[PDB]
Design an enzyme around this catalytic site. Structure first.
Site, PDB file in Angstrom:
ATOM      1  N   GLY A  60       0.813  -1.203   0.000  1.00  0.00           N
ATOM      2  CA  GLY A  60       0.000   0.000   0.000  1.00  0.00           C
ATOM      3  C   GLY A  60       0.849   1.255   0.000  1.00  0.00           C
ATOM      4  O   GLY A  60       1.694   1.446   0.876  1.00  0.00           O
ATOM      5  N   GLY A 114       1.104   5.604  -0.442  1.00  0.00           N
ATOM      6  CA  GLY A 114       0.471   6.907  -0.433  1.00  0.00           C
ATOM      7  C   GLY A 114       1.092   7.772  -1.507  1.00  0.00           C
ATOM      8  O   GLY A 114       1.740   7.265  -2.422  1.00  0.00           O
ATOM      9  N   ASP A 136      -7.851   9.588  13.089  1.00  0.00           N
ATOM     10  CA  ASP A 136      -8.565   8.883  12.029  1.00  0.00           C
ATOM     11  C   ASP A 136      -8.942   7.460  12.433  1.00  0.00           C
ATOM     12  O   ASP A 136      -8.425   6.490  11.879  1.00  0.00           O
ATOM     13  CB  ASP A 136      -7.723   8.856  10.751  1.00  0.00           C
ATOM     14  CG  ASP A 136      -8.507   8.377   9.543  1.00  0.00           C
ATOM     15  OD1 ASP A 136      -9.751   8.312   9.625  1.00  0.00           O
ATOM     16  OD2 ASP A 136      -7.879   8.065   8.509  1.00  0.00           O
ATOM     17  N   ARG A 191     -10.602   1.223   8.116  1.00  0.00           N
ATOM     18  CA  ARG A 191      -9.481   1.195   7.188  1.00  0.00           C
ATOM     19  C   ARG A 191      -8.161   1.365   7.932  1.00  0.00           C
ATOM     20  O   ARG A 191      -7.087   1.214   7.350  1.00  0.00           O
ATOM     21  CB  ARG A 191      -9.631   2.286   6.131  1.00  0.00           C
ATOM     22  CG  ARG A 191      -9.575   3.692   6.691  1.00  0.00           C
ATOM     23  CD  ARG A 191      -9.844   4.727   5.617  1.00  0.00           C
ATOM     24  NE  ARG A 191      -9.801   6.079   6.160  1.00  0.00           N
ATOM     25  CZ  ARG A 191     -10.821   6.677   6.765  1.00  0.00           C
ATOM     26  NH1 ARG A 191     -11.977   6.045   6.909  1.00  0.00           N
ATOM     27  NH2 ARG A 191     -10.679   7.909   7.229  1.00  0.00           N
ATOM     28  N   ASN A 192      -8.248   1.683   9.220  1.00  0.00           N
ATOM     29  CA  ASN A 192      -7.061   1.896  10.039  1.00  0.00           C
ATOM     30  C   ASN A 192      -6.898   0.845  11.135  1.00  0.00           C
ATOM     31  O   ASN A 192      -6.315   1.119  12.183  1.00  0.00           O
ATOM     32  CB  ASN A 192      -7.092   3.289  10.666  1.00  0.00           C
ATOM     33  CG  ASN A 192      -6.717   4.377   9.679  1.00  0.00           C
ATOM     34  OD1 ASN A 192      -6.205   4.100   8.595  1.00  0.00           O
ATOM     35  ND2 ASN A 192      -6.971   5.627  10.052  1.00  0.00           N
ATOM     36  N   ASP A 249      -2.395   3.530  11.785  1.00  0.00           N
ATOM     37  CA  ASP A 249      -2.665   4.802  11.127  1.00  0.00           C
ATOM     38  C   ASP A 249      -1.910   4.880   9.809  1.00  0.00           C
ATOM     39  O   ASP A 249      -0.685   5.002   9.795  1.00  0.00           O
ATOM     40  CB  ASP A 249      -2.274   5.975  12.033  1.00  0.00           C
ATOM     41  CG  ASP A 249      -2.836   7.304  11.555  1.00  0.00           C
ATOM     42  OD1 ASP A 249      -3.151   7.436  10.354  1.00  0.00           O
ATOM     43  OD2 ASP A 249      -2.958   8.226  12.388  1.00  0.00           O
TER      44      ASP A 249
END
Ligand SMILES: CC(C)(C)c1cc(NC(=O)Nc2ccc(-c3cn4c(n3)sc3cc(OCCN5CCOCC5)ccc34)cc2)no1
Length: 270
Positions: free
Chosen positions: A18, A20, A134, A138-139, A152
């Site tokens: 994954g 960013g 957050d 998804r975290n 996170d």
């Protein structure tokens, strides 16, 4: 960060898990890490090819003092010398809980077990006086057992790409996961994450459905939350669980229950 330094030469990269916009998380094989056991699988947090570097550094400084908890992605080591900053974490095999549940689209106890461990893990953060900006499905990551870990994806997730992050200021934020006081007054307390937990609690028992289905984030949306509007009961949830969600969805921040209570609330259900 005193003794957490791990040799970069004893680290063997794999596939990316994954990426960013400016950072990535990859799989790796670490030699000489736990008991110097046969090289195990680890999660390495890094940046893709400057000001942003410091953001990752403080994230490492946070882990070493926060201590190790069963329901929090554990720090195994780090590489801060001679090259790009590496953050070695405990590897989770089944990835995030969000993609894991829509993949399921496993008993009802497992849904409770997940929520219990998340609330128990959040209690450890409240005890350390830490606020998760957050908190969502998804975290949170799942490993070989029935245990879930809070994490996170800062710099790990392309927040620009995900539809969950809307532009409401000079940066994207998870609108459907935030508390009212955070929405208009920008107030972030631990009881604000309780709200986020309630939203998180929904997607757990709604199997990864986006919250407030069919209704997008617009001028009208903000007005409903201000009017004390809450979500209907998810399909795979019972009556007792839904009351916890709406308790977490109390408009008054004081009225929302503490995570300590949540650990005891769901615990009694065994
Ligand atoms: C939360 C807290 C403590 C406040 C905090 C966090 C923080 N900062 C962080 O926690 N950062 C962070 C980011 C990612 C991970 C992470 C991601 N993954 C793992 N760890 S293990 C894993 C496995 C994945 O799946 C690969 C293949 N899949 C396997 C299973 O089947 C499907 C495919 C995907 C991602 C993934 C850990 C920490 N700073 O502070």
């Amino acid at each position: 960060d005193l003794k957490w330094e791990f040799p970069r030469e004893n680290l063997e990269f794999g596939k990316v898990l994954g990426s960013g916009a400016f950072g990535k998380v990859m799989n790796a094989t670490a030699y000489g890490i736990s008991k110097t056991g046969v090289s195990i699988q680890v999660a390495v947090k890094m940046l893709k090819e400057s000001s942003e570097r410091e953001a990752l550094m403080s994230e490492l400084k946070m882990m070493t003092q926060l201590g190790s908890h069963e329901n929090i992605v554990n720090l195994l080591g780090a590489c801060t010398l001679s090259g790009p900053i590496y953050l070695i974490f405990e590897y989770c095999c089944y990835g995030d809980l969000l993609n894991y549940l829509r993949s399921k689209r496993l008993t009802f106890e497992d849904l409770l077990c997940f929520a219990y461990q998340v609330a128990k893990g959040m209690e450890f953060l409240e005890f350390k006086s830490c606020v998760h900006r957050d908190l969502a499905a998804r975290n949170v990551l799942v490993t070989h057992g029935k245990v879930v870990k809070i994490c996170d994806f800062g710099l790990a997730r392309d927040i620009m790409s995900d539809s969950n992050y809307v532009v409401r200021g000079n940066a994207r934020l998870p609108v459907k996961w935030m508390a009212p006081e955070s929405l208009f007054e920008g107030i972030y307390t631990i009881k604000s994450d309780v709200w986020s937990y309630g939203i998180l609690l929904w997607e757990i028992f709604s199997l990864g459905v986006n919250p407030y289905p069919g209704i997008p984030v617009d001028a009208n949306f903000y007005k409903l939350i201000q009017n004390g509007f809450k979500m209907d009961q998810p399909f795979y949830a019972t009556e007792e669980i839904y009351i916890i969600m709406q308790s977490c969805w109390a408009f008054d921040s004081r009225k929302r229950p503490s995570f300590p209570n949540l650990t005891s609330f769901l615990g009694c259900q065994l």
